[PDB]
């Protein structure tokens, strides 16, 4: 239930100085944090969709859950990424 | 790193662990792939503050634990990094 450790590690490496190192257990920690992030947002969206008797978690439900939970700054880059992904 | 490389099937599998998730739209995993890249990058940068504050150049799990305590947006990781 985790994203591939090499992808997580590549994103981490791009964030720190080129000379820095990342311990294996820190890559594994971030791997777990990512999965919890996805589950945390999904839980918020899924409760809302249930309250509204809707059977599909849509993109707006994920974005709204992110906005509610402190990640409103993600909404605009995600919309742009999705639009560009589909164009 | 290109966000398109993240496996959408794995993101969907994680979402599907939720007890109230029935169907998921096609776009939801795509949005989470980009969100994952933003989240990892910000968390790593915030942990690296503590790496350097401790006069180290290796990012360690304790640095991530400290970063989580210093940003409200990471409050939800309280049990993941104890």
């Amino acid at each position: 239930i985790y994203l591939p450790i090499a992808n997580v590690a590549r994103i981490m490496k791009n964030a720190i100085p080129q000379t820095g190192k990342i311990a294996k257990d820190a890559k594994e920690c971030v791997q777990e944090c990512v999965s919890e992030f996805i589950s945390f947002i999904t839980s918020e969206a899924s409760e809302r969709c249930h309250q509204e008797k809707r059977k599909t978690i849509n993109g707006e439900d994920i974005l709204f859950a992110m906005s509610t939970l402190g990640f409103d700054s993600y909404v605009e880059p995600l919309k742009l990424y999705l639009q560009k992904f589909r164009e | 790193f290109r966000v398109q490389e993240l496996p959408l099937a794995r993101i969907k599998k994680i979402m599907k662990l939720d007890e109230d998730v029935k169907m998921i739209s096609a776009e939801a995993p795509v949005l989470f792939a980009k969100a994952a890249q933003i989240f990892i990058t910000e968390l790593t940068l915030r942990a690296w503050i503590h790496t350097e504050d401790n006069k180290r150049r290796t990012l360690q799990r304790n640095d991530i634990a400290m970063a989580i305590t210093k940003f409200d947006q990471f409050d939800f990781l309280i049990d993941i990094v104890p």
Binding site: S39, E44, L69, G70 | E19, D75, F76, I78, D79
Partner: peptide, 13 residues
């Protein structure tokens, strides 16, 4: 902002 969702996620985990 996250507190109620955290309490809930703990039961799910």
């Amino acid at each position: 902002k996250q507190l109620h969702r955290i309490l809930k996620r703990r039961q799910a985990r």
